[PDB]
Amino acid sequence: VASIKVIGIGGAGNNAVNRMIEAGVQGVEFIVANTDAQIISVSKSKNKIVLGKETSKGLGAGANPDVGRQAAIESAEEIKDALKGADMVFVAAGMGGGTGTGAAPIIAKLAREQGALTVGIITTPFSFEGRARNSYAIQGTEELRKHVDSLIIISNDRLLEVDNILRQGVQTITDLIAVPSLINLDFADIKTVMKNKGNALFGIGIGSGKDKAIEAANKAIISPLLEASIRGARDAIINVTGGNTLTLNDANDAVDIVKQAIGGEVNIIFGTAVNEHLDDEMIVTVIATG
Amino acid sequence: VASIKVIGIGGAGNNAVNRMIEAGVQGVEFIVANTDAQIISVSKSKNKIVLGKETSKGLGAGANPDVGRQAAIESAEEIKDALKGADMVFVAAGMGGGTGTGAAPIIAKLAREQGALTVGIITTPFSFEGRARNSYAIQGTEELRKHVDSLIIISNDRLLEVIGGVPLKDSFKEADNILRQGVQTITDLIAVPSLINLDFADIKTVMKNKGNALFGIGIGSGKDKAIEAANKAIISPLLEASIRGARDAIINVTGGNTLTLNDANDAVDIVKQAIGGEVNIIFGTAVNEHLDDEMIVTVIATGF
Numbered sequence: 001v002a003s004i005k006v007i008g009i010g011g012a013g014n015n016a017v018n019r020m021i022e023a024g025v026q027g028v029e030f031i032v033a034n035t036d037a038q039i040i041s042v043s044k045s046k047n048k049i050v051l052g053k054e055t056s057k058g059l060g061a062g063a064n065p066d067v068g069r070q071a072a073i074e075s076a077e078e079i080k081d082a083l084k085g086a087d088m089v090f091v092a093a094g095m096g097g098g099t100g101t102g103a104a105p106i107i108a109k110l111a112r113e114q115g116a117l118t119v120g121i122i123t124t125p126f127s128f129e130g131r132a133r134n135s136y137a138i139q140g141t142e143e144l145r146k147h148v149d150s151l152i153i154i155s156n157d158r159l160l161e162v163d164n165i166l167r168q169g170v171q172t173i174t175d176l177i178a179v180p181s182l183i184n185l186d187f188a189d190i191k192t193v194m195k196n197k198g199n200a201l202f203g204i205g206i207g208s209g210k211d212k213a214i215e216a217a218n219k220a221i222i223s224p225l226l227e228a229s230i231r232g233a234r235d236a237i238i239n240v241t242g243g244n245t246l247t248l249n250d251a252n253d254a255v256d257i258v259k260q261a262i263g264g265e266v267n268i269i270f271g272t273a274v275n276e277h278l279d280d281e282m283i284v285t286v287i288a289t290g
Numbered sequence: 291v292a293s294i295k296v297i298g299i300g301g302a303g304n305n306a307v308n309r310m311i312e313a314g315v316q317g318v319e320f321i322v323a324n325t326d327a328q329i330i331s332v333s334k335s336k337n338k339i340v341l342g343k344e345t346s347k348g349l350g351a352g353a354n355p356d357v358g359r360q361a362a363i364e365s366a367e368e369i370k371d372a373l374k375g376a377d378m379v380f381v382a383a384g385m386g387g388g389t390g391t392g393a394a395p396i397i398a399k400l401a402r403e404q405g406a407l408t409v410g411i412i413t414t415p416f417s418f419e420g421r422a423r424n425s426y427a428i429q430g431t432e433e434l435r436k437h438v439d440s441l442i443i444i445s446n447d448r449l450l451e452v453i454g455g456v457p458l459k460d461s462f463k464e465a466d467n468i469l470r471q472g473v474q475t476i477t478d479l480i481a482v483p484s485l486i487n488l489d490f491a492d493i494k495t496v497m498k499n500k501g502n503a504l505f506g507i508g509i510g511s512g513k514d515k516a517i518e519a520a521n522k523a524i525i526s527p528l529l530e531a532s533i534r535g536a537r538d539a540i541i542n543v544t545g546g547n548t549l550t551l552n553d554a555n556d557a558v559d560i561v562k563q564a565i566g567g568e569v570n571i572i573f574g575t576a577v578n579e580h581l582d583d584e585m586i587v588t589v590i591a592t593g594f
């Protein structure tokens with residue numbers, strides 16, 4: 001009977017191990033390791049290791065893989081004790097953060113030096129977690145690969161198919177001023193809406209198919225991006241984006257809902273733009289202030 | 291014709307400006323600023339600023355907002371010069387790091403004092419980025435709000451809900467599940483008795499001293515479930531490369547109580563033909579009684 005252990009490292013690895021326990025994976029011993037004692041405390045695993053107990057003190061490593069690496073080196077003897085006797089060790093982690101990225105290669109090396117067949121199984125971060133976390137992931141992936149027998153890499157980007165939001169926010173306002181289309185706005189109109197206003201709420205929704213203008217406009221009003229409710233906003237800007245087939249009739253049908261949803265005396269302005277990638281699809285974007 | 295400038299600060303802002311240029315946003319001038327001179331040199335932007343060229347020496351701020359703030363102050367003249375004449379300035383940054391958090395409010399202050407309508411548009415961190423980063427982010431946000439006309443705040447938590455289509459609490463449920471399947475694909479074959487198990491020594495032959503192991507999963511149902519499941523596994527989006535030409539592979543065939551030997555046999559033959567050559571294939575089976583007229587084929591391929 002092979003002795004099989006899974007050690008889940010960092011937040012992602014800790015949650016993966018919880019999933020394995022709740023799915024009833026059999027024949028396997030589960031261990032979780034983290035520098036963050038809070039995640040460890042809600043673990044379903046019976047074998048818990050707080051990495052770097054003396055230096056990080058269970059408070060977490062933060063963003064920097066060097067701290068997760070040093071935490072695992074400090075805990076080397078506890079890790080060897082937990083893994084001792086394994087014929088096979090899976091090292092589970094999400095690349096991108098301070099703990100999984102830096103600790104997983106150390107733990108792989110210790111497991112393999114004990115004689116276990118050592119399999120790394122990791123995720124890599126979304127593109128939109130940004131270049132710094134993706135760059136850490138790349139370096140931690142290479143360091144782990146050095147120390148595991150085999151490495152399985154699961155891309156969170158690709159796992160979706162089984163994109164930049166700061167761009168969408170800017171273009172929502174600028175196309176209405178700088179790109180002439182069916183309807184456009186003056187810069188002085190944007191200024192009355194946005195000058196000396198504080199918080200501005202951003203919502204986006206998209207409608208596929210004919211009644212799109214009602215669908216998109218309705219998703220926008222409740223977009224999770226909305227920091228608060230748009231109800232009662234003194235002023236608001238609406239951007240109705242579409243394809244070559246976009247019409248002025250549909251535009252006011254989208255805007256009508258938003259004017260309804262805000263109600264009151266809302267100084268509401270709007271405008272249009274077209275997109276060479278959308279056929280019948282039509283996305284509504286709202287910015288409201290007050 | 292209004293003068294509109296976007297200044298992207300730090301990693302997230304630089305990234306955002308690159309994507310605006312590539313998407314061909316029109317009617318806008320773009321500027322990038324970073325303490326990191328390396329990230330800047332790659333930028334496609336025509337207007338570049340290395341913040342704090344003396345105090346930071348071209349090296350990033352290292353998660354410390356104090357360094358972003360001081361590098362921006364030191365570069366105030368270059369910032370004024372790039373923004374001069376704007377009717378509207380968008381200040382774009384990601385809160386929580388060293389550069390964006392500290393530099394964005396200084397840049398907004400400068401832009402607004404020059405006369406621009408000044409709009410901050412920022413992300414705030416994913417909750418999994420931890421406590422110190424989410425706390426820096428909130429300070430940075432409150433400082434930025436003092437120096438902009440308006441502030442659009444995009445939570446990266448909410449952005450992940452919007453992109454994945456599920457509540458935050460479930461945002462990584464599929465990833466957790468794939469990691470569980472990656473383990474279970476192999477461990478069931480070794481440790482859970484079924485009609486077809488594999489010996490640990492044979493797993494070792496496939497996985498020891500290998501490097502990258504390709505992983506694919508497919509599910510199928512109905513009369514042609516094996517053809518459907520196996521072909522989905524071999525072009526699975528999870529695979530980091532083609533399995534064509536692998537030297538060894540493990541195949542897990544999991545089905546319900548109605549799975550036939552013929553189904554399991556067809557799936558193994560499809561994977562062998564897809565890989566090709568003289569691939570050493572080993573395979574085993576597993577029962578999951580919650581499957582109803584479905585089967586799941588998983589492949590782990592090594593050796594390139």
Ligand SMILES: Nc1nc2c(ncn2[C@@H]2O[C@H](COP(=O)(O)OP(=O)(O)NP(=O)(O)O)[C@@H](O)[C@H]2O)c(=O)[nH]1
Pocket residue numbers: 127128129130131132165299300301302303305306350351352353354383384385386387388389390391413414415416419423446449
């Ligand atoms: N949606 C989104 N968020 C990003 C992106 N890039 C970075 N971020 C977010 O912005 C936060 C700050 O990242 P970043 O801009 O690289 O910080 P910095 O200040 O430039 N780098 P440093 O800390 O090394 O000085 C990140 O913690 C993350 O939450 C991105 O492309 N998209």
Ligand SMILES: Nc1nc2c(ncn2[C@@H]2O[C@H](COP(=O)(O)OP(=O)(O)O)[C@@H](O)[C@H]2O)c(=O)[nH]1
Pocket residue numbers: 009010011012013015016062068093094095096097098099100101123124125126129133156418462465466469
């Ligand atoms: N499978 C899974 N992945 C996660 C989860 N949370 C975050 N991630 C991904 O894993 C990467 C690292 O997150 P985490 O493990 O919490 O970082 P760390 O503990 O600080 O090292 C992130 O960059 C995300 O891409 C989760 O709960 N489950």
